[PDB]
Amino acid sequence: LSQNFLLDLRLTDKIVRKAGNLTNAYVYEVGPGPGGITRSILNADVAELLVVEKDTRFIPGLQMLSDAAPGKLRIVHGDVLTFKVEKAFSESLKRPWEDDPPNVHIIGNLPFSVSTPLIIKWLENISCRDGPFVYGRTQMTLTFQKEVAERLAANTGSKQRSRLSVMAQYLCNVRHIFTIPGQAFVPKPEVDVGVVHFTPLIQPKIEQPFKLVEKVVQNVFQFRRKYCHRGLRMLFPEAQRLESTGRLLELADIDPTLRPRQLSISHFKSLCDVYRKMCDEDPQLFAYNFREE
RNA sequence: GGUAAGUGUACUGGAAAGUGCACUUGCC
């Protein structure tokens, strides 16, 4: 539940500029409380604004706008996590993948406790081209915490280079655009808020299943300041770990003295592609959870 | 020594913050 509100008509209006030209668009907004952005979206001449809101306190104020803008704002009382936007718009709007993005957009100012699990849920959806991505390469404009925004957009060798960097950037073009200060919200939180734009890639930079990249990225990054080989080890049961780790790094041409923050997405394609071949040869390797064995 | 803030720093795929460490400022 949200307890810090963005109501500056200057900042909500600037968020919807960064989403692009929406002048006949079908927009799905997830966050809206006081509808600050909601008002900003409707003044952009969208075709429809679909809006989901769990908190009932905000729905009378959203109806306030479904009448000041008749035939423009569809309201839904619901949970953005259970809600299926795959069926919220017509099949006529579905563009192919190797086309341009569709006329469907996601804009969102969720609580960070909702938006952080959800961006990963949506990243898996991009992988499977289902979910919000039945329409094609649906773009999304979301608010994360200043720090989380930088991790999604971080390049190699930087300090915010985390798991979220690779899980996002291999599937999406990611632009951390600007950062609103906490003082602009009401009441003020003890954090700053970043704004990030996602555009799904026609060809992902790793073509492996999402759960496979997940596992490689999770193990590379689990020991954070150390040699990246400290983490890649744990993909392999102890009995084969010495030989399977050396074979992994050598075939992928990875320097084991590299740190997790130093590995390009190219390095992950090589690690993932070779790890994919190891699981094809040993059908019971992929399930090795080192945490107990 | 115990404690609580603040600052810096490290980490977080469950970040409107949290935790470790260092220093500073107060207190017991």
Numbering used by the authors: 33 to 325
Q: What did the study's authors say about this model?
A:
Comparison of these two complexes revealed identical fold conformation of hsTFB1M and h45 appearing at an approximate 10° rotation only in the stem, possibly formed by base stacking. In the structures, the ‘GGAA’ tetraloop of 12S h45 flipped out to interact with hsTFB1M. The N-terminal domain (residues 28–236; residues 33–236 could be seen in the structure) formed a canonical Rossman-like methyltransferase fold with a central seven-stranded β-sheet flanked by three α-helices on each side. The C-terminal domain (residues 237–324) contained four α-helices (α7–α10) that likely formed a scaffold for other functional proteins. Electrostatic potential surface maps showed a positively-charged region located in the C-terminus of hsTFB1M, with interactions formed between Arg183, Arg256, and Arg257 and the phosphate backbone of h45. Electrostatic interactions between the phosphate backbones of h45 and positively-charged residues in hsTFB1M were critical for binding. Conversely, in the crystal structure, the four nucleotides in the ‘GGAA’ tetraloop all flipped out in order to interact with hsTFB1M, either for anchoring or modification.
